[PDB]
Amino acid sequence: YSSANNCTFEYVSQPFLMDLEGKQGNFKNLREFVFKNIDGYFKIYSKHTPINLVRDLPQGFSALEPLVDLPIGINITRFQTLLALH
Amino acid sequence: SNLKPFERDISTEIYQAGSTPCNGVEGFNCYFPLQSYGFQPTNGVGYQPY
Ligand SMILES: *[C@@H]1O[C@H](CO)[C@@H](O)[C@H](O)[C@H]1NC(C)=O
Ligand SMILES: *[C@@H]1O[C@H](CO)[C@@H](O)[C@H](O)[C@H]1NC(C)=O
């Protein structure tokens, strides 16, 4: 983006530093999320786990902890992802 | 349509009583969803702001 206009909410967490430079191969971290909207509350659950696997999803039980509950009240029908290009 | 609890309907689409295209026009079956009251200190009890 190149703008910021008519904002009704902003949140920023504490700054950290993570992998940014270009790498290609087996993935190292699987970060799973659940996004749901209940009565205007946007509930985000997630779990980050180490992996050593490039192929399809590993089989194995893993529970997702809750992390965020955002009161937004927006009628959501579509969504899109954001990809990083080197 | 009606609203779900705690829905904030900010939309300003042109309401149609019957069925006709509307493109921001005020016409027969092309009405606005936005309406207002004119509150004056002399208006009736049921017409005062709360
Ligand atoms: C956004 O801000 C402008 C101010 O120029 C205002 O006129 C407009 O109603 C606001 N809301 C939207 C949805 O654009
Ligand atoms: C949300 O928007 C869609 C239009 O894409 C509409 O059909 C639907 O009724 C809206 N939901 C509510 C609760 O108004």
HEC secondary structure over chain A? CCCCCCCCCCCCCCCCCCCCCCCCCCEEEEEEEEEEEECCEEEEEEEEEEEEECCCCCCCCCCCEEEEEEECCCCCCCCCCCCCCC
Integer angstrom CA distances of residue A80 from A57, A72, A84: 21, 18, 14
Neighbours of A37 (CB within 10 A): 14
DSSP state of B16: -
Experimental method: cryo-EM
> Which residue's CA lies nearest to atom 11 of ligand 2?
A75
Strand partners, A47: A32
Residue A37 CA to ligand 2 center (angstroms) comes to 14
CB A69 within 8 A of CB A46: no
Q: At how many Å resolution was this determined?
A: 3.1
CA angle A52, A55, A59 (to 5 degrees): 75
Which of B2, B4, B11 to mutate to probe the A interface, most A CBs <10 Å? Answer: B4
